[PDB]
Design a protein around this ligand. Structure first.
Ligand SMILES: N[C@@H](CC(=O)O)C(=O)O
Ligand SMILES: N[C@@H](CC(=O)O)C(=O)O
Ligand SMILES: N[C@@H](CC(=O)O)C(=O)O
Ligand SMILES: N[C@@H](CC(=O)O)C(=O)O
Lengths: 326, 326, 326, 326
């Protein structure tokens, strides 16, 4: 059997409710040895080793967990056939993309969680975890970057996003679709991501102890500039704008960010709009202001690539090419 | 023929391309008599009168334009058979919802835009504008609230959202679906909104000249609490959290807003996730901290209802009632 | 607690899997008396009486089960507060619409199934059944027509369709969206179908022991007319064309069906295309040929309305009126 | 500039009616010179040669047009830089997959239609044609198989399907998603089909004047077996079942096709259900009956691969291996 390491970080898959039909619970309550033993069939398709890295709700996910996870996987790559990371759904799409750019291991790295607490009727965690291990054990899963396996679907860490607050089917790759579908432990893979990932990226966090400070500001009618101004006064290295439409900024946010960019704050235009690219050549002259367009990266993912971009360069022209290749 | 008043506010429907093949353009620079003459077929279905209220890209939409639009429709209601507002697509969903709560005219009020500039090769604007006027002149359009007509679809102002940065088919009612489909100038209406709108809401902005201050903060991994701190230091009346998953907040944004809530800032838990409700009875005890759950309202829409709720009450229990009925 | 009757017909929610890691199985095995025993929680929300009316895979669903189901509900209406019908997922969308037209009981009639076998890890059935009973027990579910409750969503029987082959989230109301979402045993209803259902239809199967014969022919490049020829020769009362695009027909199929319409076979143009209306005033002159356009009814659902229309009228103009109202 | 051959076959892109505003029209009315002359901007990107192969509605597409199109592309491959095929939307997805398998030219072959006739207000054809020519002229479009370009999207000919009867955005790759998006004449390609196409298929139609006879039968409640019997009685080479759910058959249709397969008719189980795979190891024991499972191929596309499969072999076991590779 392949050797699979489960790195547990918490989430609703480790999530514990008061009853089976009542929606109240706490993420990150159950340990990894209890997750594995709840699904005995795991032991017939893989030699499973668990470690608990942290036990938090992914709403509390942060740079320190991200750095720990990249280093652990890079370090233990040689000692295992594949990794499964149990994680909350809330920021799974962020950790998946971060590991997609930082992991130098091209063994399957699969992230999995659950939308329903382990204590609820029709808990999705068990089958998700089973299918995550199936995916991490498949040689065909190798070299596709960091994968998210939820609801019988293998999704790439770059395009995967939580599209719904409660549905077991919430995770979708809203721009380019999934890599594969799992039926009876077999994966019909018809796609692989084209942007560079894992071992093909220049980002190496092995020596990094902290990442550049990147904040996100929301745009909306009558938007306040206070959020943008607070991040600039705090000396943030980068700001992502969750623009309206094709990455457009409310006038006062535009002014504050246009200024901050002249003073060498990195500014990426992304969109609150869940699907499609924030493009160049629309209503914002990026060249004039030193702004980067995020393409299909949504604000929280844009933050991820900007943080890693700002470990190599502060040049907007170079951050743009980073955003066009990763 | 029915009298239809078109109130122009700008946007890409009044948007001017550098060219037809080229995607570069400026929003809100063509006047309203130019939109009407550009579609002469309107003259056979309606008696169209145009007024220019403003000429802005809707990325710059604000409280003043909203109050003006509401005051104008309420004043002119008995002068016309229907309104069509031309509007930029970027913040159309925010404007439609505001007017859906504040307009006391139960004549059809229809909002329309274009995703491609008028100068573009297969400009969506002419047909949108025709169908908006058709919709505004159908007697069956009355009593459904403020409508958005885009891509042959009638959407209610509450649920409609921009789902894609560039696609002509971007506007979708992502939780509950459209009200109707237009073919050959006929509308198959199979739905009507259940939530109270227009003349069944207590909200009256007719003697208001300013609205309560409500800002939105974004949640993500390692989120800064400075955006939230800046808004409470500036004495914002209300804060909407674009939370992760089912309205969850990052640790420090939590601690900051929980203190703000107990010092009389209205705090609404919404979600960055594009579909589904921020529910009560998940991971956050709203009763303990005095938080309101937005339900299906996305952050920018939750802001609109919070702004209005704060003209009547600052009691969180009552503001939750409002979010459960409007 | 309210009185809820579960009428079992079979399906994957009774479908005993080969096991937990296996999606190979047989639909129809277990019986009503041991549904309330697998889901003890039902006893906290309803006084549940279960009757088995048949035990089949819903791929074998037929006119006889439809008539017995409708007469059952009509007869027992006054003896219960609400009905749940457990059903295979494959033809749920047909039965649901059949009942939606023929049931005269305006108490909740809720259909429910399961996409995963009862033996599967993360089997969906139990929570679906719980939620179906919550929906049947909620007095706000009254007068909305026949309901399908799957994946935490209340769907109307006219628009619900199976969109995916395997996904637990397969059931969507693809044209007009769902009526409500269920969270923590509470339903947020924001819609009700406008089309006439149950009590407001003139269809009465109370005295019918048989239905008109309506078949379905598929269109595609180089479509054979032999399917259409065979149903016309066998004296079928009605043919539903699953056309290409906007209900268009291959020339030789168009030919057979224009002749059949002339010899008094009822012909309904529908579409293989999963979403959108088959409209009048497109490429087919329906007035000329005696054809009816199905609107948003897909081929299967249009079969259901044609069968029932044919019990009142054989006049194309009148069948078209029926198609524009139910 | 590159040499782009447009092979015209007709469709609504070459369709006209009496009105910009009225929906009535005839497909395949306008010649290719009129389409090209309608978009002068073409002259700035390609050296366009147009040939009229046929002028039909794609509802009338047939095996002769398919063979003519495959032979033309194969014969003229070396004389041009890329091909654009103007086609009706109704059976585009069928033709596109036929060519994806039979074309041996690996220059861009791009198909394109319009959902609105050329005479309509906001006609989609012009910009779709511009973008199909941009796609055929882009060197990144080579080696991705036959492409469909619609609504700014580059779609692979295998997964693409028409999802809506009227919407300009109807074409989606519903299982695996699109290959690329077009903004401002630039394609962000992030995917390529992994299933073998064009020059890696063994299928060669260069010597064929006929394709084996394959018909499609539809499954529903109380389905008639006469359509299936009628194709067997006519000695059809192949039958594709449009099954319910995961490729299931009504009892009479099952019996007729079990019988037929026993007697040497190739039987493919597909599904009426628009998304997801018809899988093996579900409720039908395919090995026992000699049935092939379509995977993600819908009925009309399973017909294409079965027709070509039947030119190499009649062994169900080998036809299944083809459905797993192409
Ligand atoms: N708050 C939870 C939600 C989930 O896991 O589904 C988390 O992200 O950890
Ligand atoms: N920025 C433009 C976008 C549009 O109109 O499509 C506006 O919102 O005014
Ligand atoms: N084949 C089953 C499908 C299911 O219930 O999931 C049935 O329709 O009976
Ligand atoms: N019937 C037309 C429809 C279209 O092209 O949109 C065709 O397929 O030729």
């Amino acid at each position: 059997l392949p050797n699979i390491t489960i790195l547990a970080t918490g989430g609703t898959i480790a999530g514990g409710g008061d009853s089976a039909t009542k929606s109240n619970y706490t993420a990150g309550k159950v340990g990894v040895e209890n997750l594995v033993n709840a699904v005995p069939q795991l032991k017939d398709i893989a030699n499973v080793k668990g470690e608990q890295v942290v036990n938090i709700g992914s709403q509390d996910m942060n740079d320190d967990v991200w750095l720990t996870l990249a280093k652990k996987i890079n370090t233990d790559c040689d000692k295992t056939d594949g990794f499964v990371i149990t994680h909350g759904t809330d920021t799974m799409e962020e950790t998946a993309y971060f590991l997609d750019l930082t992991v130098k291991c091209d063994k399957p790295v699969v992230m999995v969680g659950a939308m329903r607490p382990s204590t609820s009727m029709s808990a999705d965690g068990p089958f998700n975890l089973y299918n995550a291990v199936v995916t991490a054990a498949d040689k065909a899963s190798a070299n596709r970057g960091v994968l998210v396996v939820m609801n019988d679907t293998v999704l790439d860490g770059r395009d995967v996003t939580k599209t719904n607050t409660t549905d077991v089917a919430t995770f979708k790759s809203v721009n380019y679709g999934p890599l594969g579908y799992i039926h009876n432990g077999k994966i019909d893979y018809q796609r692989t991501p084209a942007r560079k990932h894992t071992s093909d990226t220049p980002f190496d966090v092995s020596k990094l102890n902290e990442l550049p400070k990147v904040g996100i500001v929301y745009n909306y009618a009558n938007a306040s500039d206070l959020p943008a101004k607070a991040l600039v006064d705090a000396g943030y290295d980068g700001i992502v704008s969750a623009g309206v439409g094709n990455g457009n900024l409310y006038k006062t946010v535009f002014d504050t960010l246009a200024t901050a960019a002249k003073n060498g704050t990195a500014v990426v235009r992304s969109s609150r709009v869940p699907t499609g690219a924030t493009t160049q050549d629309a209503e914002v002259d990026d060249a004039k202001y030193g702004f980067v367009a995020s393409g299909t990266l949504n604000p929280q993912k844009a933050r991820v690539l900007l943080q890693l971009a700002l470990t190599q360069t502060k040049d907007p022209q170079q951050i743009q090419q980073i955003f066009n290749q990763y």
